[PDB]
Ligand binder design. Structure first.
Ligand SMILES: Cc1cc2nc3c(=O)[nH]c(=O)nc-3n(C[C@H](O)[C@H](O)[C@H](O)COP(=O)(O)OP(=O)(O)OC[C@H]3O[C@@H](n4cnc5c(N)ncnc54)[C@H](O)[C@@H]3O)c2cc1C
Ligand SMILES: Cc1cc2nc3c(=O)[nH]c(=O)nc-3n(C[C@H](O)[C@H](O)[C@H](O)COP(=O)(O)OP(=O)(O)OC[C@H]3O[C@@H](n4cnc5c(N)ncnc54)[C@H](O)[C@@H]3O)c2cc1C
Lengths: 402, 402
């Protein structure tokens, strides 16, 4: 399957992780990476975190040194590829040949149709450019409206509050983090943000805006100096769609990263792939997926005897005093709570079970427990539920014993 | 892409349509078809229709004469395939080599978990064997319970009523034909069946059964001599899953029928594919898809310059006095009704529009209008809505003029 030369479209974390693994696995042929951003490859999670404090992009760059002998074509957009001719057409007029093409083009923020012709600042937060523009607007005592109660919106909320910015947040759902969070976590997170002064508006949508005021579907108004929209992302799958690959807001791939087009692979945010815990296809939107899927696909390309991608999903979110870690499924048929759920010195763990089997876990300010829980999750452990609830139980011991 | 020999798994309509098109398109190499049913290939729609009257399977066979020089291995199950070795393992101990493998294995009825250990006759209606067993039980004045208000259940309802069988029908949804029918149609169909003596129970599910009585979730009972379960189907994608193809209750394919595994294609009920009207992936469960997708995939395999599959979805259902035809989407932002919707001499047409563009249509006992509407639908016609409603308008003229 691994035919030289290798061409990768996109230069984010999935791409970097993939090319480093190709080299480490022993592939020595040509590798060329096309990245549309004119930026040394960088990690995105800092952008709604410490980057908002220090503004230093040289703290967030990805290490490409495990990827030697790679030509990175930065500031260049892949415009199309021809899977018969095995070529990629570039915005600078050049063409690249490929033996193996890898689509690692990520996802872009959804726009808000109702703010389409707005006459006040409206941003999304995906890129370094976005983060710099938003950060420049976090003036103390200014008003920020965040649209969407996803993790990135909430990370920005905590960041802005730290900066002395007044924060309102509007969410269409009755809860925060509706996408991949246990309700117990979501409820607590709302309490935390409210206590930090975030003005939360649930079950509201943006209907428009007039002369610096944002309008909502309950017939009300929110004044803001800046709006940041964070209502989710859409896969950057246009090249795949045009070339005849199977796509539906994401490129369908199997556990080997194969698309429906021979010699074309995809990885990271752009893919729609099997979640082994739910057994359903999903577009996973996580840092860990980008890295882990990139590595697994590279490893199997170099060594076809290697297993396909098999890691179970997890993410982290850093929201002010809350260091949140979530693995697996948001719910099963049972939740076990370890510790008190309290705003005082927040520290707790949730475990989700399905007929006795661990299917998900959450740690808030409890990193020590998260590793053992992910191990228990990976093997589908069925531990004694009394022991799981018992504060006397050491989860690392439990994980090591299985 | 077309490498000999060709092996097809499944011998239903999709398979037959595909192999006939390969031969008609000019492919002269080996073709072998593996079909698990020990039956001359046959069409399924008659099974809930006239077959219930005449019981003559020799009226429902598929014509395989446009597929000369095909070896049909009937009564044989493909147990696995090895996509590296390019072989298929058969239940009879033999192995088949392939250059091109085509998965056309269809879908199987969902079982009802709550009737799992039932001690009364419970059938599903998919195969000739099923139809013969059900037909043998349509005793006049007996009681039949049908679970599910999908088209096949309703076709059986009409058939049983014609045979003098008392019919009850339980549906979890508040309406019939929730899957792919305009609400106006579904409401009318319920009125029709009720007028024909069908005892319809909406928003009810089966919780179990005791000594010949079926139990429902509203705490009530239904006595039946026979139960026929028709709550939908599940793709027969186990071989694909085991071999590492991308699957999620159906094998993902592009418009060329390609799976994520090189040299392996899929077609028909087993596939999850793009609906060009919704732009979303869906498992299409129709006669027209089986034939049309089979033909398109064969044509493009023989002639790579041919377009991919591009037909828009449609189905028919024959329910007593109702000859129903439905194309495209169930709804848009506008419905236009042609004719009166009446139980007297039922005859009407629905047209669904989205911002002026036809996105779906329905004809009840109005076949003459269905062809022109499908043509208007295919080109995304934007006809004058006043003309569309006007009974004076000839739709065939309108279609020919575009
Ligand atoms: C602000 C922010 C905070 C985040 N925080 C967390 C977190 O705390 N925890 C967590 O688990 N995840 C978090 N993530 C998500 C994580 O960063 C993503 O899952 C990850 O970036 C996905 O990596 P990727 O390489 O697949 O895609 P991307 O990072 O999107 O990289 C794809 C690259 O390809 C480029 N591209 C697209 N099309 C073309 C083309 N035609 N030609 C050339 N280049 C193209 C894109 O512009 C982009 O530069 C966060 C993301 C953001 C944006
Ligand atoms: C009772 C009934 C009524 C219907 N009525 C209508 C209608 O009025 N209008 C309409 O539009 N559609 C109708 N349909 C749907 C239409 O018949 C289906 O869409 C069509 O049968 C799909 O064809 P297929 O070849 O993809 O799959 P199938 O017809 O299911 O054929 C697949 C074949 O592969 C076999 N198979 C599976 N696995 C293996 C294996 N491992 N090895 C060998 N063989 C295998 C299966 O057993 C089966 O024989 C009806 C279907 C049924 C069952």
């Amino acid at each position: 399957a691994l035919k030289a030369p290798v061409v990768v479209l996109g230069a984010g974390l999935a791409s970097v992780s993939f090319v480093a693994e190709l080299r480490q696995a022993g592939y020595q042929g040509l590798i060329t990476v096309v990245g549309d951003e004119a930026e040394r490859p960088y990690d995105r999670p800092p952008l709604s975190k410490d980057f908002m404090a220090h503004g230093d992009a040289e703290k967030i760059r990805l290490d490409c040194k495990r990827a030697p002998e790679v030509e990175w074509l930065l500031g260049v957009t892949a415009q199309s590829f021809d899977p018969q001719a095995h070529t990629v057409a570039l915005s600078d007029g050049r063409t690249l040949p490929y033996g193996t093409l890898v689509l690692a083009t990520g996802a872009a923020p959804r726009a808000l149709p109702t703010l389409q012709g707005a006459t006040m600042p409206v941003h999304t937060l995906r890129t370094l450019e976005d983060a710099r523009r938003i950060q420049a607007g976090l003036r103390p005592q200014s008003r920020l409206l965040i649209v969407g109660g996803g993790v990135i919106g909430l990370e920005l909320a905590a960041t802005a509050r730290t900066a002395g910015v007044h924060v309102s947040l509007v969410e269409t759902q009755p809860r925060l983090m509706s996408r991949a969070a246990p309700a117990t976590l979501a409820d607590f997170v709302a309490r935390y943000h409210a206590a930090q002064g975030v003005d939360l508006r649930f079950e509201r949508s943006v209907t428009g805006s007039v002369d610096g005021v944002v309008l909502l579907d309950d017939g009300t108004r929110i004044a803001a100096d800046m709006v940041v929209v964070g209502i989710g992302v859409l896969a950057n799958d246009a090249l795949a769609r045009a070339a005849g690959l199977a796509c539906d807001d994401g490129i369908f791939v199997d556990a080997y990263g194969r698309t429906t087009c021979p010699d074309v692979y995809a990885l990271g945010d752009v893919t729609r792939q099997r979640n082994p815990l739910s057994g359903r296809f999903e577009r996973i939107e996580t840092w860990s997926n980008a890295q882990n899927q990139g590595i697994a696909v590279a490893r199997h390309l170099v060594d076809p005897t290697a297993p396909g991608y098999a890691e179970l999903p997890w993410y982290f979110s850093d929201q002010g005093a809350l260091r949140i870690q979530v693995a697996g499924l948001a719910s099963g048929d049972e939740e076990i709570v370890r510790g008190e759920v309290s705003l005082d010195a927040p520290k707790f763990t949730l475990i989700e079970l399905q007929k006795g089997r661990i299917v998900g876990a959450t740690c808030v300010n409890n990193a020590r427990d998260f590793a053992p829980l992910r191990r228990l999750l990976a093997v589908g452990a069925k531990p004694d539920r009394a022991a799981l609830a018992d504060p006397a139980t050491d989860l690392r011991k439990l994980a090591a014993a299985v």
